[PDB]
Amino acid sequence: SEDAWMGTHPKYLEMMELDIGDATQVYVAFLVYLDLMESKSWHEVNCVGLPELQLICLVGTEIEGEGLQTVVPTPITASLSHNRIREILKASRKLQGDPDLPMSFTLAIVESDSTIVYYKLTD
Amino acid sequence: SEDAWMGTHPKYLEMMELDIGDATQVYVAFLVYLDLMESKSWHEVNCVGLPELQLICLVGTEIEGEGLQTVVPTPITASLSHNRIREILKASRKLQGDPDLPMSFTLAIVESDSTIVYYKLTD
Secondary structure (H helix, E strand, C coil): CCCCCCCCCHHHHHHHCCCCCCHHHHHHHHHHHHHHHHHHCCCEEEEEEECCCCEEEEEEECCECECEEEEEEEECCCCEEHHHHHHHHHHHHHHHCCCCCCCEEEEEEECCCCCEEEEEEEC | CCCCCCCCCHHHHHHHCCCCCCHHHHHHHHHHHHHHHHHHCCCEEEEEEECCCCEEEEEEECCECECCCEEEEEECCCEEEHHHHHHHHHHHHHHCCCCCCCCEEEEEEECCCCCEEEEEEEC
16 A cells, blocks of 8 residues: 555546545545456446546446446545535536436545445435 | 344334334444544434424433533445435424524434544534
8 A cells, every 4th residue: 555645556547537636535446446447347447537626536337238327536634515416416417428317426435554345325 | 132122222222212113224223322432532422313304303402511512323335415404403493492594414324334434414
């Protein structure tokens, strides 16, 4: 766990090259990225930065043709405020460009050591 | 045995005798009930059924002298919606008999590995 800060891991470096400038995102997203890939291995997982709402998120396609996966990095220390999720919905709905559909997203709750707990949150 | 007619744990049996009729509540609430009692230590843990809202919840006194503690059972595969939480707020607020106090509640997230993760959500 010596490098999850500098950029020695290619996948980690790959993530931090995002045009936002947030070390917390890159760390937390890296941990969940490794879970998604090495545990559920979906068709496609991407890392998208939304500078205007100020958040980075992993969105991809569960199954090609489909999508419905938005996972956001969230450390245990982050308490839940409905204001943010409302902004997250807006973020996802905007990037998916779908005309105001009832959707949702999964909170990736990470402990700083290794425990990722996926908490599924809906509108 | 004398408590294995329906279940097989007296405390669990106590919990299912609630007037609602939900096996998910009794399972998940039992796991968190045992955590609260044996691990987190409370002074009073109650299990209250709100058939109106279709939720069951544990409310008691973490410390008797206070009067603000509400924990709701939420499985790791449940979907928490901002819609639900405002309903949960309404549930707790009518339970404690105050219609305007901005309050909060804890989410008791239970993993399939029996891992209870307390996630504190605020209004």
